[PDB]
Amino acid sequence: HHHMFNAKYVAEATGNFITVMDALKLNYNAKDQLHPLLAELLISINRVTRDDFENRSKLIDWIVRINKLSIGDTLTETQIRELLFDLELAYKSFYALLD
């Protein structure tokens, strides 16, 4: 079949998904840690497709939330778990777009 997406872009987006997930697991919880990571993830996703796939908007929601943190203010342990869960769902919906 026809493959509509650039495979280098997808490899990068995929790597960025896993990166942020690992960072989360290594207890990165502050704006200065998480914001550059989420931001590059979103840039990388958009390079593959601008389609507003399921759960993509949550990622934007988290970026705006994390951006509002004061320096030294962190995400709560439970918010971290929520973020990791949203990133998995967004990954899965991304993956499903791929062909």
Swiss-Prot record:
Sequence ranges assigned to domain VPS28 C-terminal in this UniProt record: 5-99
Compartments (UniProt record): Cytoplasm; Endosome; Late endosome membrane
Coiled-coil annotated spans: none
Top-level taxon: Eukaryota
Similarity comment: family membership: Belongs to the VPS28 family.
Function, in words: Component of the ESCRT-I complex, a regulator of vesicular trafficking process. Required for normal endocytic and biosynthetic traffic to the yeast vacuole.
Assembly description: Component of the ESCRT-I complex (endosomal sorting complex required for transport I) which consists of STP22, VPS28, SRN2 and MVB12 in a 1:1:1:1 stoichiometry. Self-associates. Interacts with VPS27; the interaction mediates the association with the ESCRT-0 complex. Interacts with VPS20; the interaction mediates the association with the ESCRT-III complex.
Protein name in UniProt: Vacuolar protein sorting-associated protein 28
Annotated source species: Saccharomyces cerevisiae (strain ATCC 204508 / S288c) (Baker's yeast)
Residues of the full protein shown: 148 to 242 of 242
